[model samples]
Structure formats: structure tokens, C-alpha cells
Target chain A: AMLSGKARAHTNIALIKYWGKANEEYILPMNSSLSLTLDAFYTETTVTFDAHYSEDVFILNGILQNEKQTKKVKEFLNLVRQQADCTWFAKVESQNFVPTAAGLASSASGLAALAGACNVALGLNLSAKDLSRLARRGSGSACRSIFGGFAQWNKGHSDETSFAENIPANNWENELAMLFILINDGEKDVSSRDGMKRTVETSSFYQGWLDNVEKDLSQVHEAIKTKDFPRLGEIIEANGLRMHGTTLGAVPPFTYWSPGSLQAMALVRQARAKGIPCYFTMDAGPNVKVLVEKKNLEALKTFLSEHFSKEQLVPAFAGPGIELFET
Target chain B: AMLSGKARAHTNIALIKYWGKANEEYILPMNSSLSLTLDAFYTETTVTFDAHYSEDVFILNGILQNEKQTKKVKEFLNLVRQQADCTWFAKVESQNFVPTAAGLASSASGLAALAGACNVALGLNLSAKDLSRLARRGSGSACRSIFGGFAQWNKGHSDETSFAENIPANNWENELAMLFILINDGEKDVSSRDGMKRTVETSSFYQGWLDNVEKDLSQVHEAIKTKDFPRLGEIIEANGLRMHGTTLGAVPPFTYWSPGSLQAMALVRQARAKGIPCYFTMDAGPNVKVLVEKKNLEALKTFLSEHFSKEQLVPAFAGPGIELFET
Candidate 1:
């Protein structure tokens, strides 16, 4: 009998970012990271295993993927097959539901959904911790997306010990909101994988980033426990800048910021000066994400709308964990 | 008897920046720094000790400065008086010849010129080393302005050893040039003195900056010796960004870059990509400075003029040491 399963998973934005990797093969990070799962962006993936199939097939967003485009997914599926002790070929289909202009990476949601679908299709009754660990092998940040609301990926010494679990938060969905300011939706000049590798090997400031992670992580944990919005916002903004800072110290130094990114940053500062308590964070891209309370969400959107188009400003709140269904 | 002297000193831009202080009171630096004195911007000061004035008077740019405006100069002059064992109050008139819109700091040339004028008026006949030491007490970077071409400020263990001297270069004037992109000609929100204090006391990345300075310094020295323009430019750019990177890690973190600064940086990188051998460095302000060879001066200027107005682009070559004249 043929078996098939489908799963939906949401994407997350790191407050304390996971940058350099300690072990590339296992997707082990150099430091622990914390993030918030967002409801606005997600991926739905279906995996089907059948004995009649001659070779693996992959489709992304309604288009058939070539071998090069599907290589990573194929490698990931092989891992799932090894654990399940099954020799059947599989076909994977993934569709990303992220905003077209948001300029956010869909890898975190895409890989997590793939991991979940494979788990269900193979009848592997893996625990949440085990699923998170499995998802991490496909992408380091995918592990964090396996849970709901706030999650922290512990940078364990080995693959067996590393996994992500939900961090306790008090009604995070009601209190917190993230507004995305799209600066550029184009492809990046340097991929995150290559950028992280160069920074880890060549940046003089990478050690400094590693040295300060614990203090930021611990403070963020405390802030979350106390529901201190101001404290949490400050830590999130600073931590993101520090992560981007390491890139400038790389050999033949490069910065991810474009002129638009700087303009957006200045606007955020201007809004803060006008007594709006908001903070911003950026990933390995030029886009900016503003963190504010849901009470102040419309105020921020109104202020930013003067500079950005209504379509460019995307708002999101806390989302749920992966959901599974038969396909 | 009446004694009078006039001196002129040029400003210098640090390639390897001095950001934090080891001892604030003595103006001792946390690490050694290197810079190139430029010909375009300078300060000329005349000192007169007539025994006729009851108090020290300062006139800057033809306007008599009030007590509040002249307090730092007064404190610096007091140190000079103590060293010379002189009792008479002096009248100091300083004229800054910097471009009105360059957005460059005048303190380095102003203080260094003051030290030179005082040295001559008091008949101190101090050595170059002693003069640099005196200039340093007024401003940390002023010591570097006492030398022409390339100079290195040694971060010594005490006040007596912390001084700057000329580094031997093979006629750097004809070979190297710097172009200033004036992003903002307004006053900075945070003074360098306060910014340094905050970074040293609060920034987690401060130690990393100090840790990597020796390697940068040594490599820059070798680059200068070998006259390797690309190597020198790369090191100069990375060291500057590393210094600026520490600011983002400060508590209540801030950045000196404006949108225009980011635009200028992108233009510089674009020019470099198009085979114009140029690199950029920034200080405690929004202005961006590009280091290039004289051979590519016009090409860089032409490329930048497309983005910035011709008036906003200013160029400079190596300048001379202190020149004294009887006044």
C-alpha cells in the first residue's frame, strides 16, 4: 500500500540569531538561538512513498525541480528513509505561502514541513524533540520552527544532544507583533551559507559575538519570563546588529545593508524618539522587521506607511506548531 | 618683554582608528593607531604672552570664544604653562582652513597647532617627541597631526611613553590620495569623547577590538613598507569598520552612518568592482573617506560625482609637519 502525508509549518525570525555553524554536516550552530514563530508566513509540504516509483521526484511551488534544485531535499529524504528502514522511493511537493515582497527566506518553514511530512508518511512516531533534531539536519533554523510561539535552539556539543524546545512566554500572541519593512526582494549577493562560512573563518569580530551570546541569551530569557517589552526589544535590536557587525570584520569585508536599509533604520529611530516604543531586527538580508506590542501595531504601521507602501508593510503575530494531515 | 609665535598643523585621518582610552584623564589610548596627515585641512594659531592680559583669551575664526567654548583649550594651556613655569596669561587666535562642507573634525589640527605655537612662544625648544606628548593631552589624535605622511601613535603604559612619531614611507604623497564624501555637515549627536567612554565601559565587543589591533597594526606597517596599496587599503577599511562595529554593541547602541553614508559606501564598492582600486573608512561621524592611489583619483571622483555633487567630493594628499612663523 502507498503511504502519503502532508504537514504545514510556520517561519521564525531570530531575536538572538544563529550565525556561524560548528558542524556543517549536522547543521550544528556555534551558539544557541531564540526566535518567534510568525503566523504570516509558512510552507505546506506533502511526501508520498511508493514501491512503483523508479526515482525520487520533487516539485516546488507548482513547478518541477531539476536535480540541482532538489539535491538538498533528496539528501534530507535519504536521512528519513535510513531511520525508517524503508527502500521505497518518494515524491515531495512543497508550496511556500510567504508574502512575495517581504524578502524573507522560506527555508526555515520549508525544511521543517518536509521533516514533519516525512515523519508521518513513514509511520515514525518521533517525539517533538526528536522531530526538531531531525529537522535541524536539513537547516539549522528549521529546528526552531518545529515548535509554536517562542523557541530556543540549544547549541549542544553533538547532534544527539542538540534540539529546540518552546520557551515559556505569557500570552505572546496577544502582546507581541512584528512588522516587516521590505527594503529589497531581490536575491542576495552572498548566500547565508557562504557568508556564515567566511565570517566564521575570517572575521576578527566573530569571537566577540560568541563571547557575548550567553549574556544576551540569559537576559532575553529573563525578559521573556517577566514580559518586559522594552528590555526584550532592546536586546533583540542589539543582538541583530552585533550579528551583522561580524560581517564587516570579514576579510574583504561586506555589509548586507543597502541605502534603503539605512533609511528604514533611521525611520525606526525617528519613531522611537517620538515616544513610540518599537525596535527593529534584520536577518542576512536588507529587509527590516520592527518589534512592537499589538497595542502599538497600528501606530507603527501608520507611521511607517508614510514612507512605505501599504503592501510593503506586513504585520504578523505568534503562530502554532506543525500540523499533520493525510494526503 | 613680549613674546609671540604662530604655527600651522594639518589634520590626520586614522586608518587604524583609536576608539577607546586606557586612561581617560591622561588621554592614553587602549591601542596603537596609525594615520595619514592630509594637506587640504589645517589650523593656524598665534600665541601671544604679553603680561598685559589678566586672563587667557581665545579667538576662533575671528570670533572671541566665551568661557564655555574655550574651557578645553584653557585646560590644555594650563598644562603647557605648568610645564614652562610661566606666569603670564596668553591670547590665542586660531583660524581653521578646512573646507566649509567637508564635515571633517578640526580638533586634531587645532590642538596640535596650539601646542606648536606655545612651544615657540615659551622658548621651550622641546623635541618632536615631547611636543607630540603635549598635543596628546589636548586630544588623543592630535599627537598624530604633529607628523606628516604616515604616523603611528604608540599606546604606551604611561603618560611619558604615549606619543606619536613619523613612520618612514617611500614618498606617499605622489602615490596615495584620499577623497572625502561629505554625508552630513552637521554636529554629531554623540561626541567622540563620550562615545569612547560608553564603548569602553559598556560594549561587549570592545575587548575584541583591542585584541585584534596588534595584528592589524603589524600588517599595516608591513604594507606601508612594501608599498602594497591593495593590502593597505583592505586593512585600513576592515580596521575602521571593526572600530565602528564596537559602537553597535554598546548599551543604548548607536551608529554614525546616515543613509547618505551607506549610499557612499555602496558607490565605493561599486567603483572597486569596476576596477577602481579604492577603499573606504569612517570615523565618529557620518562622512565617508575613500583611500585610493593618485592614478585612480579622477576615475573615482568621476564615478562618485554621478551620485554626489562635485562640491561634496573633496580630495587631499600627504601634508607636511608643523610649520612655525614669527607673528
Candidate 2:
């Protein structure tokens, strides 16, 4: 048996937005979200579920966890077992390397990587599209993690078909930069999955967010195509505000504003006030990643460093979603 | 001056229902609600509000209490002062005869009664129209309580014009009766004002409730006029359900239902399963008040008694609103 093997998955970020699903059990998003998969951090866990293991068990990174959480793992195992017709229950061992949390979603990365790893471990040799759909069962955001650059998880009919597709990352010049702001256990948090469900159920505001999404998505695609940073930043910031607004309208409403997030916005506003032409974008966490001209990095870092804690902020310039690393 | 002039303010149930308003200070209802006043349980509170007091205070059943517990009580007191133009704040010595520690809305009855007694005490000689507008400042339902059976609190634009007009109790024909099925109470719930505000701010369902209300109210009004009990019951039950539905969908969702509510509904269904015709209505409480024909009361009561404890159920018929007393 192969001891270790190459496994990969992509992460999906919401572009337009997905508030509520028309159906829940099928895990359908109300609207489509377009995202990108970055190569910076990817989990290539090597998993193996063997018949030699004792009584239905799962080991995650060499630690045994509850089996009930393995509903999806068991489901995928059943799909693989459909071909095997095995009498014994299964165990899946998965490890995911999330590039990092914050600016981009890590659960998307973690679960996507796990999907690819588990599928490979099962000797399923599933296609990337199949892996993306499998990963989506774990988290709505995970579907896009299977791709390198601009990815679209179209609200395709349902089940197997509802997933992310990898679009080409090829560009003449790198147009976007993500400054990763690492955050740990921030306060007043609602998971994106939970947030979207509540938005569907509770918020009167979700309708307005939904109506404007198609235009926003098309605009973002055009902006990306045109390499327009100002337009891109405006849309990102507006979309983030709408995302956070949906969070606030959830049943038991929440806002993930660490003092750092407010301060991050403050710094961005100060940049505008000072005519520095800098802007920021935040994902599911308090951490903010800014896109700016590569030449303005020194000035931007100096401005950020003065206000932010030394370790909190990380400088990142425009980098490609996929990069060729040492084999 | 008279020691205690007896004036009973019956609870006014919302028909079309109300939500957030253009002005919060005036406490206007978002829509018109026609209501029937009850004769049985009411808060016959007397408010002297003597000028020579430490500060504005409410003497609840001869016991001094803080204004915080009944915030609207304070609001009513303020409205009285603003209207009466009293330089000195008065002590609101009052009494409530109705049952406490249940799902009963005391404010609706209490504020209407307060509006009556205080209006007289202030010697403003305000008409029932003035009394209604004044009562609404305390709670939206209280405005409707200022009128008699088949009374409609017209959703007028201005404060002076906005009053619960006494719709002629022309032909209910004593065809309907509301059976109050008492339920368990665990804690002091949100004030109706706050509940409405939360519903307006958060509930997606609230908008739909408002949109479809015109026909609901018109049809019900015609039904009332024609004494069409069956049609009346259907529309009204749906109205009550939608009003409470908004609360259940409010940002921080809440349910007023108790075991008694379910049991009462079961009893109604059981009766319906038999040859008997019985329909039920629920207001803000876990109380299920069955509105049925008087001729069918015996069979209905017998059917309900099998499930509901005799102590829990109270028979209510079409009764007059706040009975004017000048003794």
C-alpha cells in the first residue's frame, strides 16, 4: 500500500453571497458565491481507513474524537464502500494545513484538503469536481477550496452537482494581494454556515442583499478582468459590510468586531483621509487583508505598524493564488 | 374628590396588528386593529397621582413600587403630566383586580383604565377620542380598549385624530365566545412595545403580515357586520396567529406557547373530530380562548373539560369596552 500520496482541495470565498438555501438537507445555497483558492497554505493529509482497526473508530492527527461528528465521513465512506461492499465500518484519518485563518476562510481550506485526502485514502481517485462537492458537505465555504484562482460554486441543481469548479488562474500580471491578519478565538462570533441559515430564516435585510448580488458578482468578474483595484476594493468592502449585516440580523444576532477590526477599519479610513489610497477586506474573522500597490507596501506597513500590535498584522503584496513550489 | 371611582378597562386584542411606527414618542400603531372588550377580567386601577410626592411613583395595590418594572406605567404618567400641564409630578396610587401570574396582558387593560381615571383626575374632560390617543401612549392595544364591542382603533395619521372609534356592536348576535385556557408562566416576558419593535426590526414574516392585512381586516369587518361566525373565526384566528408569528420570528425569537396551548388545541381538534363545531383563538398568551356558538356551549364545554382542568378554563362572551364611570 502507498504510505503517503499527493492530495489537494480548494477553498471557496463568497463573492455575491449565499444567505438561505431553498432546501437544507441537500445543503443548497440560496445564491451562488464565487471565490478563489490560494496555494499559500494547503493541507495534503494522507488518510487510510483499514479493516485492521478496532471497533468503528476515527483518528484525527493521531487523536481519537467523537464518532457522531463523523456523519459526513461515514457518508463519504459509504459512497466509497458502495464499490467495495464492505461489512466492516470505516475509520478516516485526516490532517489539514489551513494556510492561515482570517482574511480568507481556513475551514474551507481544511475541509477541502480533508475531502481530497480521504477520497485518495479510500482509493476512490475521484475527480476534483467530485472532491469539491464532497468537501461542501463538510462546510459551504469548503467547495471553492478545490481550485487555484477564481472559482465559482454555482448553485447547480443539487447534491453531487452542487460544487466549485476551478477556473484558470493565468493572468498577465498578478492583480490582487491579501494581507493575512491572524486572529485567535475572537468574541461575538457566528460561523458562516450558521450565519447563512439565520439570514435565510430571520433577516428582513437578506432580500435586499440577495437582489443586488448578481450585479455585484458580474461587476467583480469584470473588475477582476480589467485589473481595477479601486473598483475591486469598493465591492469587497461593500460585500463584507453586507455579510456582517446578515450576521447582525441572525436570530441571536452577532458581530465579530474585535477592537482590532474596528482599529483596522480606522487605519484604512485614516489612509483615505491622508490620501494614501489604501483599503481593506475582512472575511469571516476580525483579521483584515488589504490590497494595495506593491510600491506602497513600506508606507502601508509603517502606517499599520504604528497602530496595530507588532504581531497582529502581516504584510502581503499581490500574489498569485497558485504558485509552483519545490517538489 | 371621589375616593375610588370604579372604571374597568378590558383587554383590546390586535386585529390587523401593528409594528414599528413613524414616531416612537407618540406610540402610534402601525395599522388599525378592531377589538372587542371583555366584561369578566379587567384592571380597574384608580390613579390619584397626588402632586405632593417625593417623585413620580406608582402605588400598586397600596404598596409603593419602582417605575422601572412597569416602564409604560411611567410613560402613561408622563403623558398625563404633559397633557395636564402639572408642574408637580404626582404619585400614581392604583389598583388592579385582574388575575396576575398568567399569560394575561395587563398593560392593555391597566393603561386604558389609567387613561380613564387619570384623565378624570386631571379634570381634562378629554373625550373618548382624547382618552384613546392618551391610552395608546402607554400601549397600542390600550387605545382600542377605550371603546366597546366591535370597536376599531382607526390608524389615523395624527395624534388628535388617532382614536379608537366605537364601531356599533350592531350584530355580533352574541354568536361568539372566547374561552381563556390559562397556561404556565416562568418569567416576566418582553414588553409588547419591545416585542413589536424587535418584530419590525427583524422578522421577515412581519412585512407579509402587514401587506395582506387590508383584506383580512375588511373581510372580518364584513363578517362581523353579517354575523358570519364561521368566516369571522377563520380570519380572526389567522390574524392572531400572524401577530404572534411575527414575535416567534423576531430577531431573538421567542414562543409564548405552553403545554396548555397544545392541550387546548388538541381538545378543539378532538371536538371537531366529533360532530361538534368549535373554533379557538389565542392572543399574546399561552391562553387558548375558544370562540364558539352559545347553543353549542354545553357540548363544547364538556369536550374541553375532558382535557383542560376546570380551574384553567374561563368562559368569555362579547362584552363592552371601558365602561365609563362618573361616580
Candidate 3:
């Protein structure tokens, strides 16, 4: 007999980003980060634990994953088994609902869904905070995906303390929107894990980034509370750029920006100059995400349509928290 | 009676850049910087002082300059007049040999040439070091233009100590070359002076930049001493990127990169990946400069010509120091 559960979690875009880690083993960030869960991209993960099974099995998007890919899943499952005090092997399957070919792989949603599925399958009944903590051990940003709308991942002093929770906001879903400009569908030259570690170890500017995170986090909190779109958009753009800037100060420096990335940023700036009230942010990949109010979404889209195709722009609104059910 | 002198000075590219000022009035740099003077871009100026002239008259590129254009030159001339204890109004005629349309305005060569011409016209007979100090008031980088080959602008404690001098190199002119990729021919939206001020005042990462520059300068000196082209190229690229990175941390964060700038950088990285020994550095503008050994110049140029026009890619070698002659 097997105990099975399935869970789904949406992806998030950081307004105040998590860049460097304080504890690699615990996957603890050096600074607190805030993000908005997006409705458009998500992952549904199922886990089945059976005592008769010899080893863990993993499948992603209906394909049996290789050992290298399965290794990370197995490691994450081990943490869940440790918490439950069980030795049963598990079969895990995940489906990414994101435009994965657009460089929009949602490790946040994937890992968060895995944590949620494991919690239900094992009958652990862990709270949202504990699930966030569990998800973080797999991927640093995954913790923020445990909550919907606005969420803040507290950079606590220890593993027992660090967790993410929903931030209070007034009907944020109706007001805020994120427009994705898919610049590259290919794999990143440097993965986020490797880039973050290199930046923390070698970059001269990393300390300054650490020093300024608290103030940025506070300002973001205020912006969300006041529903100040301009202030929120400005901070989001600055924080993302600041994160990218640290990578350039690393030894044998590298940048994540491609030629298309610069073009996308220029288009956003031009639209903003014409009073469209939009701003752009980029992650570890070359793809850009523009933050705008729901009212101006059509205006920004129309302006961007001149440069990019309709298929390249994906709009998303605030999303829900993690959900789980018996399979 | 009239005293007139003609002088010429070539522009230099900072391998290790000067980004901020310690003393804005005296033009004392916040960090010591190093550069290689290039032969292809230069400015020739002739300065004349006469008892009959009512006010300073200026002509640039066969066009009479406006009051706003003439004001900066007048202020710089005031510094020279104070040094020589004279109140004679002088006519200034200057020509920029650089591709002025390529955003390669050589204020360095222009101001350094003016200082040289004034030295001869006033019969000041100042030493190279003294003339370099005079040029510092005109533009911080102009101090480096007073010396040929490798030069270092020492970020001294005060006006008396701050100046630039030649860095010893073993036949560097015969070995090293620079290739300029002109991305934009138009004026920059944020001038270097304003950009430097904003970074110094508001950027959180600026202190880190100040802290790491001495080590970068030391490594560059060692790389030049040992004739280590790879090490020299690496330091030059990293240092320039680090300087540019600080801008993104400034208030209302901005980047100097245009779409074409990123394309040029990608092309350089691609050429390097294919075993070409080249690296790129950018200033406060969109144009990028590549550093390479004279031996591999053609290989790098050949790779770039596929993307950029022949006229857009200009190659330069080490140039001479300021030259002055009585007219």
C-alpha cells in the first residue's frame, strides 16, 4: 500500500530579491526578500511513498528524469523522510505549467509543491511556516512560494526561525500586474546557485548589497501598504539592477544580460519616459519582467507590441497560496 | 605684442578607471587610475594671448563656440593665468581628430593640449609634472594625457600632491593595441561629471569600489611589469566593469549600455571564447574598447567586422606625450 498526495504552487517574482546565502546547508539567505506570487506560472507535484519500493523515482513533464536530475529530488525527499522518521522510498512526478522554453523555469513553485505534497503524503500536517522552511532547504527562493499575493522571507538567525509569510496588502491582485518579456528560451550560462555563491565569495560589492537590503525591504513594505505604484515600481527596478550589478564586481566578472535584454530594458525606459508608468526587472536569466498597474497594462502592451511579438509578452496577476489534496 | 603656441595631445583609455572625485574643485580623484594613450584620437589646440583682446575668444572644429561652450574653457584658463600671474585674454582654436561622431570626445587630449599650449605661450617653462597638475583642473583624466605610454593619476591628498606621471613599461607601444567599437555617435544623456557625483553621493556600493581599487591598481602594475597580456587584459576588463557597476546602485539607477553596446560586448566574449586574446572596457558612454596584443589585432578585428562596420571599428596604438611649439 502507498500513501499519495498532490500539490500545486505558483511562481513568484521578487520585488526585493534574495541574492546571497548565509547558510548553504540550510539554504538560508543573507537578507530578507519580498515577492509577488504570479498566477500564470506554476507547478503541480505528486509524491507517493511505498515501503516496498527499493529506491526513489522521479519524473518531470511525463519524462523519466536522469540520475543527475533525480539526485536533487532524492535529496529533497530525504529531508522530508527525516522529518517524518520514515525510511520508505517515494515516487515523485512534477508538471511545470510555466512557459519553460521561455527561460521561465519555476524552481520556486516546483520545490514548494514538492514540500507541500510530501507534507500531505506523510500526514505531517505542517503549518505554512514549517512548509516554507522545508521548501527553503531545497531552494532558497522556494520558501516565498508557500504564500500567495505578497510574501516576505525573513532572513532569520537560524533554521528554526527563517520562514516566509504573507504580507498584508489591500486587494493587490486587482491593482498590480507583471508582464514578462521572454528574451531567451535557452539555458542560462551560469545557474543561479553557482552565480550567487561566486558573487558572495568574490564580489567586492556583495557586502554593500547585504548592507542595503534591510532599508529596501522596509521601503517595499511601505509601498505595498500605501498602494503606491510608482514607489513600488521604482524600488523593484532598483533592487533588481542592484542584484545584477554585484555580479559584475566578481572576479573574472560576468553579466547575465544579453543583447535582447538591453533592448527590452530600453523599450521599457522609453515607455516610462512617455508617462506609461512602468518599470523593468530581470532575474538570473536574460528575460525581463515589467511591473505595472492593471490599469496601464494595455497601454504598456501596445507600446511593447511595436518591438516584440504578441507571443513573447505574458501577463500575470497575483496568485494563490499552495494547495494540496490526496491523490 | 602677442604670444602664441600650438600643441597636440592624444586621448587615453583607462584600463583602470577614475570614477569619482575626492575634491571636485581641485579635480582630485577618489582613486588612482591607469591608462594607455592611443594614437588614433587626438586634439590639437593653439592658444594666443594679446594685450589688445577684450575677452577670451574660442573656435572649435571651424565653428565659433557659444558662451556656454566657452565658459568651461575660460574657467580652465583662469587656473593657468593664476599660475603665471597674467590677465591677457587669449584666442583658442582647437580641432578634434577623433571620430567626434562616434562619442569619442577627447576632453582629455583637448584640455591637456590647452595646458601644453598655455605653458609655451606664457613662457612658463613648467616641468611635465607641473603641467600635468594644471591639466587636472580642466579635467581629472586630462592629467593622464600629459604622459605617453602607461600613465597613473595618483589620487593625492591635496592640490599640491595630486598629479599624473608615466608608468614604466618595457616597449609597451610595440606590444599593446586597443580597438574602439563605436556604438553611439550622439551625446550621452548623463554626463560623466553628473554621473560621478550621483554615484559618490547615493550609491551604496561606492565605498566598496573605493576600498578595492588599490588592490586592482597593484595587480595591474604587476601585470604590466611582467608583460602578462592575459593577466593585464583580465584586470582591465574586470576593473572597468566594476566601475560601471556602481552606477546601477545609484539613486534612479542607470546604465550606460545601449543595445549596440551589449552586442559589441557579446561579440568580444565570443571572440575570446574562440581563443582570441581580447577583453573589453567601457567608459561613462555606450562605446566599448577592446584591449589586445598587437599580434592578435587582425584576428579580433576580423571577428568583429562580421557584426560591426569597418568604420565603426577603429584600431589604435600607443601614442606620444603632449607636444608644444611656438607659433
Candidate 4:
């Protein structure tokens, strides 16, 4: 007999970026981060445990993952197996509805769903906070996907308390949305994990950056509390700028930037100058994400369509947290 | 009497970058900077003041300059006329041995040489420090080229003290050299003037950078004293990175960087890791300038030639201060 479970989770874009890791093994952040979960981009994952199975087999979007690709998945399941006290091998399948490695941050959704599905399959009944921490072991930003609306990942000491909490969707939903200008849907030369590691190890500005994160986190937290759209947008732009600054100081400096990224930024700036309430932020990839009000989505879309194609302007609203079920 | 005087001044690459402007009219810098005056790239300028000339005429590299091109030159000559208390206009001619408007920083030498020649042709008899001050009014880094070997431009509060002084060629000369990797010879999209203004107005890290420059200046200042070439090189690299970081944070952010810039930096890192005792620094443009000992110049050239053409790998040693000659 086999026990099966399934879950779905949404992708997120960090307003206050998480670019460096304080602890590499525990997947701990050097600074606290805030992000918005999206309704448009998500991942669905299923995990089945079978006593007769000889080994764990992992499949991603109907494609079987190699041993190297499944290393992280196997490690994550080992933790789940230890807590469940089960001597059963498993099969994991994940499907991503968003761009994989083109800076959309698909890992956040994929790992969060995997964590939730595994919890259900083993009947572990872990709390949302517990699932957040478990998902962090796979990808640091994945912890934030455990919550809906505006999520804050506290850069906690050690692995125990470093979890995510939602800002409560009822307090702030339908008021805000994210529009992405997908400049490049190709894999980046530097992965988020490796880039962060290089920046921490080599960037001279890294110390100045560590000293400054708390201010950005505090201001953004207050902005959410007061429902201040302009304040939040301003802080988001500033925080993202500071986060990217550290990369420029890295030895043999590199940028997660493309020519198209700059063009998109110019478009956003020109729009704001013309009295449109909009702001832009980016992750460790070339795509530029614009934060706009739900009401102004059509206006932004119309303005952007003049410059970019329909496929380039990807829009998403605030989404729900991870869902889990068992069969 | 037809009085003519010619002067030659070498280009200096700033180790501690000068980014923002506190006083735009005087071309004053927000932070103190240091640079190395190179022998290879320079401008030889001559000024001839005669009663027969109705107005100031300017020519660069044998090409007659238009009124728009001669604006800075005409303004500089007016300053000389003011000091000399003479109504006679002048003819100014300049020949730049290096690429202009690129990362070679030709303006530094061009303006400094022009200032020196005007001082002599008009019989103003201005001191070297006063010459630097006049050149600053033309271009900020032009102040540094007034001196030779290692130079430091003191970022004073007012126009009076914001002049550059040499570190005394006797103290450090012939021991150090700079190898240039001309990554891109094309004109930069954002001029240093525009880029600095944007960074100062919009970048969140601009304040932190302002607070941190003194430390880098101090470290490199001491490294020069102790003849710590490695320490000096490291600090130079860090300072340049911090300067470039501010640009990435600007609204409609821009980089004076090309792909070849990274390729050059990577090569420098490979050389250093292989015990080559070389480090790289960049200004607001794409060229990578490597600081190495005069003894290791051959080794660096040999290694870099594998990737870059010999034309791209330009070599220059420490040169003399501006020299005024009668022609």
C-alpha cells in the first residue's frame, strides 16, 4: 500500500532583498526580508510514501530528476522521515507554472509545496511555522511562501525561530498587486545562492549593508501597518537598490543585469514622473518587477504594452498560502 | 609681442573615485580622492596670446573645434585673461595621445595642460597649487593631473582649499606601474557629471558611502607611506567598487560598464590568485587598470596577452608633473 499527499504554493518577490546568507548550512539570512506572494505564479507538488519502494524517485513537471538534481529533495525528505519515524521510501513530483530560473524565484513555491505535501503524507501535522522552517532548509525564500499577503521573514538567530508570518490578507489585499516585466526568461550565469555567497565573501560593502538592513525592514514593516502605499513603494525601491549595491563591490564584480532590465527601469521611472504611482524592484535575475495598486493595473499594462509585448508584462495579485491534501 | 607657451600633463587614474558634486559651478568633489599619474597617456597643449586675435580659437589633435566644443576652453582662457588683466584673446591647441571620452580620463590631462600653458602664455605666474585650482574649474579630476607620481585631491569645504598636491615623487616613483586593459573605447552613455548627480539624489547607499570614504582614504594613505603595494592595490579596488555601487542604486540606474570590463577583471583575479601580486580598479567607465610593481610588468603583459590583444593591454609607468615649455 502507498500513502500519497499533494500541495500547492505561490512564488514571491522580495521588496527588501535577501542577498547574503549568515549561515550556509541552516539556510539562515544575514538580514530580514519582506515579499509579496503571487496568485499568478505557483508550484504544485505531490509526495507518495511506499513501504515496498527501494529508493526515493523525484520528478519535476513530468520530467524525472537526476540524482544530482534530487540531492536537495532527498535531504529534505530525510528530515521529514526522522520526525515521522517511518522506514518508507518516497516518490516526489513537482510542477511549476512560472518561469524556472529566470529570476521569477520558482524555488520559493516549489520547496514550500514540497514541505507541506510531505507533512500531510506522513501525518506529521506540523504547524505553518514548522513548515516554514522546513522549507527554508531547501531554499531560504521558500520560508516566506508559507504565508499569504505581505510576508516577513525574520532573520532569526539559529534555525529554530527564523520563520515567516503573514501581515493578514484582510488588512491588506486587493489594494496592492505586482506586475513583472519579464526581460529575460533564460537561466542566469550566477544562481542566487552562489551569487550571495560570493558577495558575502568578497564585497567590501557587505559590512555597511549588514549595518543597514534593520532600518529598511523596520520602515517597510511600519508602511504595511499604516497601509501607506507610497511609503512602501519608496522603501521597496531603496531597499532593492542597497541590496544590489553589495554586488558591485564583489571581487571581479558582476551584475544580475541585462540591457532590457535598464530599459524597463527607465520606463517605470518615466511613468512615475508623469504622476503614475508605481515603483520597481528586482531579485538576482534580470527581470524587473513593478509594484502597483490593483486599480492602476490596467493603466500600467496599457503604458507597458506600448513598449513590451503581452507576454513580457506578467501581472499577479496577492495570493493565498500553501494548500495540502492527502489520499 | 606674440607670447606662446606649451605644457604637457599626464592622465591620472583615481584610486579613490570622485563621484558626487557638492559645488557644480566650481566642479568640486564630495569626497577626497587619490590617483596615479601615468606616463603613457597625456595631452600637450600650447597657448598663444596675441593682440591680432579677435576671439579665442581652440583646436584639438589638429582638428579645429566648434564653438560648442571650445566652451570649456574659452571659459578657461577667460580666467587667465582675468588674472593677467589683459583684453587680448588667445589660440589654444591640444594633442591627446590617448582615447578621449572613454575610461582613459583624458579630460584630466587635457585641462591641466591647458591651464598650465595659459598661465605661462599670459605671464600670470600662477603657482602649481593655483594651477590645480584653475583646472578644477574645468574638470574636477584635472586638479590631480597638476602633480606627478601619487596625488591626493583634498575635498575641502570651499573653492579655496579644494586643490591637489603631489605625494612627492622622491618618496614613491619608478617602483609602481599601471597596466590598462582598454575594454571599451566607445563613449559612455552617462557622463560622470550626470551619473554622480543621479547617484547623490536617488541612491540609498550614497549616505553610507559618504561616511565610509574616510576609512578607505586613510587605509590607502597609510599603505602608500609604508610602501605596502598589496595593501594599496586592495584598497584601490575596494574604493572603486564602492563608487560604482552608488550608480546601481540611482533612479533609472546605469552602469559605465561593458561585458569586456568583467572579462578584464576576471583575468586580473586569475593573475592575483596565481601569485601575480596584481589588483584591478575602474573609474566610471569600462576600462580595467591593474596596479602592479614595475618589476612584474612583463609577467602581467605576458599573461594578459593570451586573452587580450597587445593593443588592448596598454602599459604606463609613473610620469612627471606638468612641464611648461616655450615654443
Q: Tell me the tens digit of each residue's lDDT in model 3 across B73-126.
A: 999888888988888999999998874423364788889999999999999998
Query: Candidate 3: deviation at residue A308, Å?
Result: 1.0
Higher-ranked by DockQ: 2 or 3: 3
| Clashing residue pairs found in predicted model 1 | none
Query: lDDT of each prediction vs. the true structure?
Result: 0.88, 0.63, 0.89, 0.85
Per-candidate DockQ values are 0.63, 0.02, 0.80, 0.27
Task: Name the better of 2 and 4 by lDDT.
Answer: 4
The candidate, 1 or 4, that scores higher on DockQ is: 1
User: Against the true structure, whose TM-score is highest?
Assistant: 3
Q: Write the per-residue lDDT of candidate 1 for residues B204-240, one digit (tens) a residue.
A: 7787788889999999989987889999988888888
lDDT tens digits, residue span A141-165, model 1: 8899999899999999998989999
Candidate 4 local lDDT, A1-327, one digit each (tens) = 877899999998888888788899889999888888889999999999999999999999899999988898898888788878887999999899988777898889988999989888887788988999989988999999988888889889988988888866455756888999998888788988889999999876677577667887888878777888899888888677677888877775677877577678778878888878999998989899999998888899999898899999988998888888776
RMSD of each: 2.3, 13.3, 1.7, 5.7
In order of lDDT, best first, we have 3, 1, 4, 2
* Candidate 3 colliding pairs: none
Clashing pairs in 4: none
Considering TM-score, which of the candidate structures 1 and 2 is the better prediction for this target? Answer: 1
> Per-model i-RMS in Å?
1.3, 14.0, 0.9, 4.4
- Model 1 residue runs over 4 Å out of place are A51-55, A99-105, B64-68, B99-103
Best by DockQ: 3
Q: Write the per-residue lDDT of candidate 4 for residues B199-304, one digit (tens) a residue.
A: 8887656775787688988998788778888888888887777788877666645667665776777788789998899988888788899999988999999999
**TM-score for candidate 4:** 0.75
DockQ of 1: 0.63
